[PDB]
Amino acid sequence: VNKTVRDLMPKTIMHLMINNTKEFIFSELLANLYSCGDQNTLMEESAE
Amino acid sequence: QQLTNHIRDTLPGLRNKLQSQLLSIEKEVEEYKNFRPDDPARKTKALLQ
Numbered sequence: 692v693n694k695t696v697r698d699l700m701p702k703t704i705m706h707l708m709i710n711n712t713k714e715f716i717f718s719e720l721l722a723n724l725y726s727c728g729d730q731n732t733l734m735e736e737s738a739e
Numbered sequence: 740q741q742l743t744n745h746i747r748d749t750l751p752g753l754r755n756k757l758q759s760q761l762l763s764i765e766k767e768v769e770e771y772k773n774f775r776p777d778d779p780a781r782k783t784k785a786l787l788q
Binding site for chain 1 (some may be wrong): 780782783787788
């Protein structure tokens with residue numbers, strides 16, 4: 692039993708928590724940011 | 740009535756296939772339902788992607 696738990700836990704997390712996050716960053720993050728209103732305020736440059 | 744009562748306890752299989760197809764389309768048709776011939780925001784984000 693111990694071997695199986697040690698084996699499946701890493702694999703579970705990579706599938707559900709890390710790879711779903713990478714796919715989010717590459718595929719959707721751009722659309723989520725653009726879809727916010729007032730892109731002018733969103734992209735104001737620092738005074739510096 | 741005899742035919743209707745013959746497909747019961749079979750429908751679950753049809754429901755799973757119909758639900759599976761809807762899941763692979765629904766993620767895409769959201770753009771189509773609100774499609775407009777004039778949408779500079781839709782065009783801009785499509786360009787960036």
